[PDB]
Design a protein around this ligand. Structure first.
Ligand SMILES: [Zn+2]
Lengths: 375, 808, 127
């Protein structure tokens, strides 16, 4: 725990990707249910979530050519969500809009580093590999199911003038009693419709997030339920099938409900290979980055790891000396961490360089090697 | 693939609006009442009311106002529907043939726009210069009232104030001016804007923006010679008019928030006000300009949805929660200190929250026992056909569930009342209700809270009432534990036990725990005039539903469905479980098939395997929409009601073709009802060679009751063609398309009504004239029952419709 | 099977001299290829036991890595620049032989070889 003087903005900039990139201020958004023909990247094996920052390093000449093509066009590519990762099956996915690129010369081979951001969910209609080797995808955009307030269907026309509202636990009971009055007309009570109210679910998630992220809910967290649900899903350390199940959800109410179910149920994080080897707990999770405790980063090899930052970890051997080369958190040296039983790569132990920093040491675990566990 | 038939057995009796004007004649005084999808016109006489006309529109009346532009002889009626169908109608009478004509009609639904939280707000300028509509946030629609505007064309104006509470057209102005109340990060304010028809824009009002009460809600436009606006909230009734600023704060209104109002004197000297609990206050204005405001307590009426002053001191009170009232206002109070005397009472069945069917009097003659009303207007309603005889048993507390037990000749009814924190310590009621005036009342014994109580806040207390079937006395009133909410109720015999029991499911609800993690299942027996607790079982969640399942107890507990056996030691023993992705709110059964339903339309059909001793998933469907009630029609059909007053029917395929497609429930039936269905239940009200198979009644929020039954393919096709031919010949009130009315309409998508026959349209065939009958039957020959094509005359379809009317 | 010993970096019987070409190869070529981000698979000999490649040293008869070249430059083992250039090219060829053309490591090796050959044309002559 302790306190922090690190400045949580540097992790989101991905300063390790060379100098200042060519940032773009535009944005392209397709229509709902509209079909598009989008190119897919071959080496990307991540399940992308809207709003999630995605850095990438591509050196293959085919990849660099496709990157140039996209830079000259609408700057949008498709990231597949693989259900079976080995056979290249894809039923769902998320698009990503490139917002920074950097091709580097005075370098061995021609390489390009790109910062993109997930945009819109989609269903995979057709996958066809071209003669080039790169594969295109005919794709249908999936819309956001924004359902209205459940009381609007049973609202009394006399009470229409009461539906606007000018120690925190009494204000929420006042809210529940005033907004869901007409619930007496149905077969269900007010507290039941309080479980399907996006604002109450958002407040409960804000409560569970003030444990990890010390930033206030004033400016950091969005106010829209869909943006809030996606931001929460971006930093939920779960395994791949759970992330796919969460991505299938259309109604943001159901998304927030499932996220609260996960946050209340799963408490321990174990090794995905061991299944019975506790690595850490939900308590030790803290946010070193603005986007949350768990964000996507890229290594020199070009692989993408979703690093979750925790204060303490258990049952981890440390391999090798610390190193500062290509460190995702400047001012910290990483050290490879393996499971104490199966020796699988769990993450890295980041120790501070300067002795006046805080925290002096923390852990960054990759999501793909973790497994949620309830007692 | 659905082949269903829905009919209205009882029209909606709930009142959602009432006005007074001169609609039929310039000398007659007319009272217009809106019952959702019904319009009732009356003439005010010295005795009371004289029924002149009742019409049925193809839309839920959201706004209803009378007005008279300079040039006409009598008033016209502006009407808006929930689907944004606007129209202006006139009354026309020639001898005995009355027909409501359509002066102007049109759709005003925007292409883009988020519907506002305050809903549809429609106002009319006094001098009849324009109509202002407030539908979406930050957009004020204006419909000019010139003689050439028969399309009802309109234009939008931009609002810098996004969160508008209420708005009124002010009297006594050269230009049409609106005065509204809004909110911003600073607080709540009131402001005025002048609407320009030349520039189609806003101009600075006559008086600037003032800061007002934090809970300022209602706005009242005061007519001449006064002018200005009155702002009413929870603690203050203020008045603004240019330089005039007058604020009062009487403590008599602090107990309950005022909701509706009406004008008494045309010049604006006296006003009636109704609050939530049902009280009626009088707001007096003292005179060229205002001198002071005064608020007196007139007395206790029904929980008013709307109010209107007739004449000679007679006032009509339209109540959706309770019965409609006509009351008298005396000059001198009576003995208890109340200026109110009830003149007449009209029945109101809304809101129906549960019901059942019993063979009370005759055997075979079904009768419907329903829970209706809420708070002091709650009651039981016994309905039988003779239009429909309805007996009322008042309860003065809110009923929630009900079931019938034959061997005991009585009913079990879950009920809830409101109490307040005692000055010392404990609770005290507001009125003596059924649970506090029973011949015997008990409390249960605990078998298992920090930051206790507050300063006089409301709390709900739940009871189980055993009520005789002959006398309807509250025989017993068993009170449940503190902070315990009763949800389900079933009367059944279980296992090899000959005793019949009342089983209740309850949840331990706390403020801090949003999701209840604690609940009970209790089993009572009633005999010899006393209730004893036979069995108790603790569970780790809310018992949302319970069902009699072939002699066992099928109970839902949050995200779990469990089966209980009845042991020889009279206990509840778990046999098997099933852990779902959703929380099981709705539970139904037929044979071994089990239906599970979530609030967001998540449906799951399971099957009990008797040789395995476990549950198995048969099918499931996930489509997000707010539900309200579910029902199993037959082995393959499943009916349900969802958001925007819509019904739907899903189907499964037993044989089917592929392992993947066998686990899907197709969306085969869709229909727009106009009513929020709260309860489905099998039964029929007619004495038991019939085209229909099955019978499921359903109760609604606005007091409407309906019946659904399946059909055959040929009969469905014939009735659909009949519906088309009848739409092409019948003149609609307001000129609204029937298919547009019955179209499954949400704000996200709109599709036509498939797999459903609107029984009201098929019934209206008998009302029209014989030439129109010959019009409809002309060139029919859609009979596909024999195998070829059989013709159809007028008498054939007359007899067909008569037999279709002989099912309710 | 198991690992072989690394190539010897020091040899007291071998002479020690610091020519212009070798000090250039140490201070420029090796330094440039060292701080390159694609250098991580070549900064040490191939640990065939960990990577589970039993057939690497069966195919690669002459191993070589950039760490061995660095330890040979620091200990003055090199007599002329031709031996250091041959060591670099032998490392590149050993990387090319074992893997398939089109793998990630092959493209990284091609990158490093291109940078080495573009830094090797600027060869200063002996003082
Ligand atoms: Zn492990």
């Amino acid at each position: 725990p302790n306190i922090i003087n690190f400045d949580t903005s540097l992790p989101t900039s991905h300063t390790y990707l060379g100098a200042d990139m060519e940032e773009f201020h535009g944005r392209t958004l397709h229509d709902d249910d509209s079909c598009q023909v989008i190119p897919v990247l071959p080496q990307v094996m991540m399940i992308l979530i809207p709003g999630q920052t995605l850095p990438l390093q591509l050196f293959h000449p085919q990849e660099v050519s496709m990157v140039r093509n996209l830079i000259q066009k609408d700057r949008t590519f498709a990231v597949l969500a693989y259900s079976n990762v080995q056979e290249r099956e894809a039923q769902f996915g998320t698009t990503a809009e490139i917002y920074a690129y950097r091709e580097e010369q005075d370098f061995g081979i021609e390489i390009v580093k790109v910062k993109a951001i997930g945009r819109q969910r989609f269903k995979v209609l057709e996958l066809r590999t071209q003669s080039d080797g790169i594969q295109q995808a005919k794709v249908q955009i999936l819309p956001e199911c924004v359902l209205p307030s459940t009381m609007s269907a049973v609202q009394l026309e006399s009470l229409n003038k009461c539906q606007i509202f000018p120690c925190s636990y009494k204000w929420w009971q006042k809210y529940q009693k005033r907004k869901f009055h007409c619930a007496n007309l149905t077969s269900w009570p007010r507290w039941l419709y309080s479980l399907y109210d996006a604002e109450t679910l958002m407040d409960r998630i804000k409560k569970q997030l003030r444990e990890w992220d010390e930033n206030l809910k004033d400016d950091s967290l969005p106010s829209n339920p869909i943006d809030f649900s996606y931001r929460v899903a971006a930093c939920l350390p779960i395994d791949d099938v759970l992330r796919i199940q969460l991505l299938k959800i259309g109604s943001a109410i159901q998304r927030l409900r499932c996220e609260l179910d996960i946050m209340n149920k799963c408490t321990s994080l174990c090794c995905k290979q061991c299944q019975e080897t506790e690595i850490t707990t939900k308590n030790e999770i803290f946010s070193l980055s603005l986007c949350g405790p768990m964000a996507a980063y890229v290594n020199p090899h070009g692989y993408v790891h979703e690093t979750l930052t925790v204060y303490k970890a258990c049952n981890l051997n440390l391999i090798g000396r610390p190193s500062t080369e290509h460190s995702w958190f400047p001012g910290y040296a990483w050290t490879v961490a393996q499971c104490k039983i199966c020796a699988s790569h769990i993450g890295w132990k980041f120790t501070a360089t300067k002795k006046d920093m805080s925290p002096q040491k923390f852990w960054g675990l990759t999501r793909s090697a973790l497994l949620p566990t309830i007692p | 693939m659905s082949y269903n038939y829905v009919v209205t057995a009882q029209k909606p009796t709930a009142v959602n609006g009432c006005v007074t004007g001169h609609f039929t004649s310039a000398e007659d005084l007319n009272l217009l009442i809106a019952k959702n999808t019904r319009l009732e016109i009356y003439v005010v006489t010295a005795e009371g009311l004289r029924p002149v006309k009742e019409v049925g529109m193809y839309g839920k009346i959201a706004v209803m106002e009378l007005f008279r532009p300079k040039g006409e002889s009598k008033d016209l009626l502006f009407i808006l529907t929930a689907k944004y169908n606007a129209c202006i109608l006139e009354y026309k009478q020639s001898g005995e043939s009355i027909d409501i004509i359509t002066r102007a009609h049109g759709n005003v639904q925007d292409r883009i726009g988020r519907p506002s939280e305050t809903g549809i707000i429609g106002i009319i300028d006094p001098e009849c210069r324009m109509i202002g509509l407030r539908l979406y946030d930050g957009l004020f629609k204006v419909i000019p009232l010139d003689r050439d505007n028969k399309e009802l064309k309109a234009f939008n104006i931009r609002l810098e104030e996004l969160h508008v509470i209420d708005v009124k057209f002010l009297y006594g102005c050269q230009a049409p001016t609106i005065c509204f109340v809004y909110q911003d990060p600073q607080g709540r304010h009131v402001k005025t804007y002048e609407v320009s028809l030349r520039e189609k824009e806003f101009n600075k009002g006559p008086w600037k923006q003032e800061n007002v009460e934090a809970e300022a809600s209602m706005v009242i436009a005061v007519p001449e010679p006064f002018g200005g606006a009155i702002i009413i909230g929870q603690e203050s009734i203020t008045y603004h008019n240019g330089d005039k600023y007058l604020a009062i704060a009487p403590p008599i209104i602090k107990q309950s928030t005022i909701v509706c109002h009406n004008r008494v004197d045309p010049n604006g000297s006296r006003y009636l006000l109704g609050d939530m609990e049902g009280r009626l206050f009088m707001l007096l204005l003292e005179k060229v300009t205002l001198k002071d405001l005064r608020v007196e307590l007139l007395g206790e009426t029904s929980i008013a949805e709307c109010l209107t002053y007739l004449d000679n001191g007679v006032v009509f009170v339209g109540s959706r929660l309770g019965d409609s009232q006509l009351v008298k206002l005396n000059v001198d109070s009576n003995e208890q200190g109340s200026y109110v005397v009830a003149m007449e009472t009209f029945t109101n069945l809304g809101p129906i929250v549960d019901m059942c069917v019993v063979d009370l009097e005759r055997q075979g003659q079904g009768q419907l026992v329903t829970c209706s009303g809420a708070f002091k207007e709650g009651s039981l309603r016994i309905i039988r056909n003779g239009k429909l005889h309805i007996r009322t048993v008042p309860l003065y507390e809110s009923p929630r569930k009900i079931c019938y037990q034959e061997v005991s000749q009585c009913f079990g009814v879950l009920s809830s009342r409101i109490e307040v924190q005692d000055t010392s310590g404990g609770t005290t009621a507001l009125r003596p209700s059924a649970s506090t005036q029973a011949l015997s009342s008990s409390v249960s014994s605990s078998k298992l809270a920090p930051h206790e109580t507050s300063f006089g806040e409301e709390v709900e207390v739940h009871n189980l009432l055993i009520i005789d079937q002959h006398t309807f006395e509250v025989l017993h009133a068993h009170q449940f534990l503190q902070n315990e909410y009763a949800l389900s109720l079933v009367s059944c015999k279980l296992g090899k036990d000959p005793n019949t029991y009342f089983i209740v499911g309850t949840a331990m609800v706390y403020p801090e725990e949003a999701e209840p993690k604690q609940g009970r299942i209790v089993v009572f027996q009633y005999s010899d005039g006393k209730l004893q607790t036979v069995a108790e079982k603790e569970v780790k969640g809310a018992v949302y539903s319970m069902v009699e399942f072939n002699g066992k107890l099928l109970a839902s507990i949050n995200s779990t469905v469990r089966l209980y056996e009845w042991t020889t030691e009279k206990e509840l023993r778990t046999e098997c479980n099933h852990y779902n992705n959703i929380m099981a709110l709705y539970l139904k059964t037929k044979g071994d098939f089990i239906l599970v339903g979530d609030l967001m339309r998540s449906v799951l059909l399971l099957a009990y395997k008797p040789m395995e001793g476990n549950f198995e998933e048969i099918a499931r469907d996930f489509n997000p929409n707010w539900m309200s009630a579910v029902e199993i029609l037959d082995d393959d059909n499943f009916l349900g009601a969802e958001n925007a007053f819509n019904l739907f029917v899903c189907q499964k395929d037993s044989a089917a073709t592929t392992d993947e497609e066998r686990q899907h429930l197709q969306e085969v039936g869709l229909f727009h009802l106009g009513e929020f269905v709260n309860v489905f239940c099998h039964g029929s009200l007619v004495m038991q060679s019939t085209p229909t198979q099955g019978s499921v009644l359903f109760g609604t929020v606005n007091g409407m009751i309906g019946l659904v039954t399946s059909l055959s393919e040929s009969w469905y096709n014939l009735l659909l063609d009949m519906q088309n031919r009848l739409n092409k010949v019948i003149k609609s009130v307001g000129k609204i398309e029937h298919s547009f009315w019955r179209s499954f309409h949400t704000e996200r998508k709109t599709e036509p009504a498939t797999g459903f026959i609107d029984g009201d349209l098929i019934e209206s065939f008998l009302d029209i004239s014989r030439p129109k009958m010959q019009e409809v039957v002309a060139n029919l020959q859609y009979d596909d029952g024999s195998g070829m094509k059989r013709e159809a005359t007028a008498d054939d379809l007359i007899k067909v419709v008569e037999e279709l009317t002989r099912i309710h | 099977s198991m690992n072989p010993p690394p190539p010897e970096t020091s040899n007291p019987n071998k002479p020690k001299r610091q020519t212009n070409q070798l000090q250039y190869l140490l201070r420029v070529v090796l330094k440039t290829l060292w701080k390159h981000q694609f250098a991580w698979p070549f900064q040490q000999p191939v640990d065939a036991v960990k990577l589970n490649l039993p057939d690497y040293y069966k195919i690669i008869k002459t191993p070589m890595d950039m760490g061995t070249i660095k330890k040979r430059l620091e200990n003055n083992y090199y007599w002329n620049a031709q031996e250091c250039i041959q060591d670099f090219n032998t490392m590149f060829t050993n990387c090319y032989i074992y893997n398939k053309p089109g793998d990630d490591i092959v493209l990284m090796a091609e990158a490093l070889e291109k940078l080495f050959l573009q830094k090797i044309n600027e060869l200063p002559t002996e003082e």
